[PDB]
Structure formats: structure tokens, C-alpha cells
Amino acid sequence: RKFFVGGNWKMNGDKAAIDGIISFMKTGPLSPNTEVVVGCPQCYLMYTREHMPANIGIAAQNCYKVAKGAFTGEISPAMVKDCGCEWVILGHSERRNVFGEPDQLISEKVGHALEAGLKVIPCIGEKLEDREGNRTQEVVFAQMKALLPNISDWSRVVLAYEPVWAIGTGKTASPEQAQEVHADLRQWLRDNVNAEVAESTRIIYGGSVSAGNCQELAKKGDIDGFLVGGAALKPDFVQIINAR
Amino acid sequence: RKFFVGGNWKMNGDKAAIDGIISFMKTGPLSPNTEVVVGCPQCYLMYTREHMPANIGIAAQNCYKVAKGAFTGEISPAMVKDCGCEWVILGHSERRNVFGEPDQLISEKVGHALEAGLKVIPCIGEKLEDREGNRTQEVVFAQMKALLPNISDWSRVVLAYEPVWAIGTGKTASPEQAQEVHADLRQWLRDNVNAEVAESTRIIYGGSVSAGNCQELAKKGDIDGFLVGGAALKPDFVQIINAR
């Protein structure tokens, strides 16, 4: 499984700041064994694709579940493609929790993004109350079951596991905690799909990943990379890309 | 009050289709006495601004309430400005009723858009049940009251009244239904702000405006323009810009 690092810029950037990230990502040096994608704000898809080296993929941070229609403020997968970009991040914690997007909607978006030809990073993960209530596994398995009916091409999926309590808080999951879930998810793929899919699908970890803690997480046998927020905006992002 | 016509493309378009809209807007003829704005999908702000003649304003179809932050999938007024665009549509029915945005949030959005120096089209409007139940006025007055604390510059606001029942359904409001609401809203401005703001603030009508019906609507004393959805995607739009 090729190591995979996504940088989620969330609601951060302007042309000048994006030039800056591009500049330090160019210089790197970036490991050629890491597959790298950056998720830029909805309004910078085209710009970021034009300016970023073709070896780095570009992701929209959200999209809707049909190609066009009466959805003021939304963009479709066809539009992401038209902007020259190949990826979309879907069901991010911030969309599930700040903006109330339910599992059903996320599944439908993932379905439509795949139909449209995009590669998708579906996001899953339990809340603090789930973690403390020893229901982490049941919660993430349920999120996976909700996505299953719409995952129509596993070769174009990279699953991101992000404990809600770990996002933006500095409270990153320990390598042991993350490895445990990733292994559960990988067997979930064997039991619900097949072994080929389980053995080839990247499962990445996100939740306060830093240059300081990334090596110890990457070591773990079922952690295939990272989804990175705050650290993606700074030059340290290079070390995370190079965590192996 | 200068006649104002906005075209809301919603989730429609790609570069080629936007090229087509621009081509027919260039041909015109467009009245110098109509202030025209188009609202494009989030990912086309920079592209539309670059190719659409600059006598035409560009609006974002949505934005969030802070300049940057942990809000995957959102864009800020600072980004809209960076993309070369001056307008944003806020509180559109489709955001209220498909994506459940509450009045408080919309008001905070308007507040921040104005602070960051954008021009804003706040949308208000009653549901069929409100209209049948004889409570249109109470509904649109509450909506205005919700906005009021955050309207920090009336000179950069155009209010859009769009009966929810009239959007995309072809069920256009009669010139009388629309005028009655517009006259009430204007009186609301006199009572809650002042006479100068009441006389100078554009109040525009939206909800299935066509080339066929725009003249009768435009003829009304308190109807200062339109917010146009479906008809904005077709050359028909020119005749609506010229409705007065």
C-alpha cells in the first residue's frame, strides 16, 4: 500500500498563502514514495491545480450528490473535474458536526463522487463520549456500514480515521490507539468485502498529526498515512509527508 | 433606487457553459440603468470574474462567518475578495431549507461579510403555509429583525424577497402579492432604521421570474429588481435586466 498523506487546508488560504505552501512543497524534499493530495477551499480548486506541481493531487473539501441543480452554495463532482482536480474529501468531522451532515447524505455524496469519476477520502471517527464509553468500534463500524452500499470502486477510495476528540485539539491518538482501530477497520473490509480489498485499501489517520509525532504513528502496520489539518499549512508538513 | 438584477446560477455550470452565459451577456444589449450581478458556484468565482466583463458584478453563493478557521468545505468573505468578487448571496431559501441554516447564522454571516467589505444580498421569504395562513408579514418581519443587528452598512445591502413557494416551481408571485410585501418591508425600514434608508435600499423580487412576466412585476412602485434563477442561465436573462 503506497503511503498517503493528505493536507486539509480547511477554511484557510488566499492566492499568496497558497503560493507559499506550493513553494515549500516544491522545495521539499518530498519522498517520491508518498502519494500527496491537498484539499483547498472550494474557491481555489482551479488556481491551486494550475500552480501546484502535477505530481500532487488536488481535493475539493466538499461536494453535493448530483451533477447539477437547485443547491445554491454547493458544487458538484462534475465541477471538481472541470476544475482539473481528481479528489474530494467527504464526511469530514467538521461537516458532520458543525454543519450537521448525516451518514446517509455522506454515503450518497461518496456514491455520486465515485460515479462521476473522482477519487474520494471518506472520513469516519468516534466522539469523546464514544471513546470513553468503549463503543469506538461499534460507532466506526456503523459509519463504514452506512458508506458500504455506495462504495462502488474501492480502488479510488482512501479511508480516513479521525477521532473527533483528536482534531485541532493537539490530543492526538496514541500509535497504539490508532493502530487498534485501523486493524479493526482492515478486518472489517475483509469480512464485508474481501481480502484483496482489505489488503490494498489505504487507511489513514488524522487528528492532530505533527512533525513531532508522525514517525511513531507511521511505523504501525495498519496506518497507511495521514490526513493533516493545522500542520498542513506550515513547512513542517514536509516531515509528515516523509514520516517513513 | 437603481434597478438591480441578480442572476443566481445555483449549482449549475462549467467553464464552457459559463462562457456561453458571458457571450450572451456581452451581446446584450444591457441597460446602463441596471446594476447587474451574477452568482456563480463556489469553485468558479475567480474564473467568472476573469472572463465576465467588469461592468457585471460577481457574487459568491454562500460564505461563512469568520475570515479563516476549522470549517472544511466553507469559504470566507476574505476569500471572495481575493477572488476579485464583491458580492455574496446569504440566507437563500436553498441554504435555509435544504441545508437548514438558521436565521441567527445567516445574520452572523451578513455581519461578517459586511465587515470584510463585501456587498450582500440577504434573502428572506415566507413558506406556502405562512402565506395561506395569513402570516407572511409576521414571518418576513421576524426574518428582518433577525438580520437587523448585523446590518452595519445599508449602502451595501440589497434585500431579496423570495416566496419559498415561488422558487423553481413556476409559481410566480403576482405583481400584487410581491408589491404588497415590498411595500411592507419598506415601511419596516422606515420604522426600524430611518426614512433615508427606506427610500434608498433596493428590495428585489425572486421566485420564477421570466422574460414573460418581468415587466408586470417591474412596473410596481416598490419592486426594484429581481433575483433570477432558472431564467438566468438563458439569453432570456437580458430581457429581464431590461424589464423596467
**What experimental approach yielded this model?**
X-ray
End-to-end CA distance of chain A: 13
Cα separation, A46 vs A85, in Å, equals: 8
Long-range contacts, B144-148 (Cβ 8 Å, 24+): B144/B185, B144/B188, B144/B192, B145/B192, B146/B103, B146/B104, B146/B106, B146/B107, B147/B91, B147/B103, B147/B106, B147/B107, B147/B110, B147/B122, B148/B192
Q: Are B219 and B175 in contact (CB under 8 A)?
A: yes
Q: Are A158 and A201 in contact (CB under 8 A)?
A: yes
Q: Does the active-site annotation cover A92?
A: yes
Q: Are B161 and B203 in contact (CB under 8 A)?
A: yes
The domain made up of A1-244 has a fold known as: TIM Barrel (3.20.20)
Cα separation, B44 vs A84, in Å, equals: 12
CA–CA–CA angle B57, B63, B66 (5° rounding)? 125
Q: Are B162 and B207 in contact (CB under 8 A)?
A: yes
Residues of A in contact with B61 (CB under 8 A): 72-73
Q: Which residues make beta-bridge pairs with B203?
A: B159
Q: Which of B72, B90, B98, B169 to mutate to test the interface with A (most CBs of A within 10 A)?
A: B72
- Give resolution in angstroms: 1.7
A 10 A CB-CB count for A171 gives 12
The size of chain B, in residues, is 244
Please answer yes or no on whether B14 and A99 come within 8 Å at the CB atom. Answer: no
Domain spans, chain A: 1-244
3 state DSSP class of A119: strand
Please answer yes or no on whether B95 and A72 come within 8 Å at the CB atom. Answer: yes
Contacts of A35 (CB under 8 A, 6+ apart): A2, A3, A4, A5, A57, A225
Q: Are B116 and B78 in contact (CB under 8 A)?
A: yes
Q: Which three cell numbers, joined as nine digits, stand for A27? A: 522545495
3 state DSSP class of A225: strand
Task: Quickly tell me which residue has 432604521 as its cell.
Answer: B193
